[PDB]
């Protein structure tokens, strides 16, 4: 483990960061938050490969309810609720890949706090 | 026929001690090492002395010298400017003053 904040705030932080990268695939944050994001997200994409109701009814907890991500319309407005993107897009990409779905880079410290910073992608 | 242009900065809102830490890391070194060293330190006195070195190189270009590729930092000073003075209300009625300091910084760029 890594203690970062109080007890029941780490649950809220790691829910709220890791519903980004489901949306953006880039996050510019610090070291330790990124390493906990490693662990949780690569636990979450493994549920993206089953497709069961247990895949829904366990991933529904650790992802925000909802959050819009709308890039498609022909004569419609279709709305991915950022859990549906696990089970329609992010799942069947890495179906032949085993573990190791993330990359972590080392850029710079921050201007006012000297906190060294980190990019996260997938591939 | 002179080498060794100069450039100063006057009454800059930092300490006189903390600015002497960066200037530990610049004496005797070439200009190519110096700007690279100054890019990768997270201090207030990092981003100040860069402007001094760039202005000194610009003096050496547009006034006297040539040979940017053979310039050496030879002298470096940190001096004490005038000190601002304020007060803080400390508990049980009384007060205690606060010094707020500034510094004068000069850097000399010779050729060889």
């Amino acid at each position: 483990r890594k203690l970062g904040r109080t007890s029941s705030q780490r649950k809220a932080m790691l829910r709220d960061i890791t519903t980004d990268l489901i949306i953006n695939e880039r996050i510019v944050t610090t070291e330790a938050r990124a390493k906990e994001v490693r662990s949780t997200v690569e636990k979450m994409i493994t549920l993206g490969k089953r497709g069961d109701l247990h895949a829904r009814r366990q991933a529904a907890t650790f992802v925000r309810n909802e959050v819009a991500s709308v890039r498609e319309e022909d004569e419609s407005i279709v709305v991915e609720s950022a859990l549906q993107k696990l089970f329609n897009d992010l799942g069947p990409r890495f179906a032949e890949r085993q573990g190791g779905y993330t990359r972590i880079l080392k850029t710079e410290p921050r201007r006012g706090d000297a906190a060294p910073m980190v990019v996260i992608e997938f591939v | 026929q002179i080498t060794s242009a100069k450039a100063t900065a006057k009454t800059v809102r930092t300490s006189p001690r903390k600015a002497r830490l960066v200037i530990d890391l610049i004496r005797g070194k070439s200009v190519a090492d110096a700007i690279s060293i100054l890019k990768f330190t997270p201090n207030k006195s990092a981003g100040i002395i860069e402007k001094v070195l760039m202005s000194a190189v610009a003096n050496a270009e547009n006034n006297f010298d040539l040979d940017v590729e053979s310039l050496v930092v030879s002298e470096a000073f940190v001096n004490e400017g005038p000190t601002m003075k304020r007060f803080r209300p400390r508990a049980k009625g009384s007060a205690s003053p606060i010094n707020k300091r500034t510094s004068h910084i000069t850097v000399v760029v010779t050729e060889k």
Partner: protein
């Protein structure tokens, strides 16, 4: 509690032999030779492993 006497000019300095700033390892670019930190993304280039990352 309370300091007994003024410390002189000698013990001002003989403390401060461990108050140094230093810089740890710096390396050339893959593609430009400019000095950049090891294991770090190139800020002036964007390259890493000779590959541009900071782009779209």
């Amino acid at each position: 509690a309370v300091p007994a006497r003024r410390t002189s000019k000698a013990k001002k300095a003989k403390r401060r032999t461990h108050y140094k700033l230093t810089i740890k390892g710096l390396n050339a670019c893959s593609n430009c030779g400019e000095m950049k930190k090891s294991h770090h993304v190139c800020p002036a280039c964007g390259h890493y492993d000779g590959k541009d990352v900071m782009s779209k």
